[PDB]
Amino acid sequence: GLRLNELSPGVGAKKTAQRRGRGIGSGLGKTGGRGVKGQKSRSGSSIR
RNA sequence: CCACUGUCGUUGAAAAGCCAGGGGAUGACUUGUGGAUAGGGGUGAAAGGCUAAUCAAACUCGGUGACAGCUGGUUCUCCC
């Protein structure tokens, strides 16, 4: 290894995790991918 | 000691009063002090009344972040 500065993970290795509800531009704002009023949009929903 | 009528007051002087009238006023009366009955329990000349401005089940803490197919909200950017 050269240095603790120049260590890259090797493109494709990492990905940014998704963050719901952080504005219009991120693609996951407001509802956060959940849709509208319904059971599956709620805070403890699942598929059973 | 009560509370029948009306006006006023209704961000009141007052979370139920004032004023003018009204009822009982030796009685199943009114009242002081202490005590007893405790929550699905009490107490009730019975209105589901009252049980500390809380009552078709008090209050406080705990189970407890109860559950909520419901309502609200959900935060930077650009490209397909």
DSSP letter (8 states) at residue A39: G
Q: CA–CA separation, A48 vs A39, rounded Å?
A: 12
Which experimental method was this entry solved with?
Answer: cryo-EM
Amino acid identity for residue A47 in this structure = I
Contacts of A48 (CB under 8 A, 6+ apart): none
Give the nucleotide nearest to A41 (CA→C1').
Answer: B69
**Which A residues between 13 and 32 have a beta carbon under 7 A from any strand B atom?**
19-27, 29-32
Contact A40, A34 (CB under 8 A): yes
CA angle, residues A25, A31, A33, in degrees to nearest 5: 80
Give the nucleotide nearest to A20 (CA→C1').
Answer: B74
CA atoms lying within 13 Å on the CB side of residue A8: 3
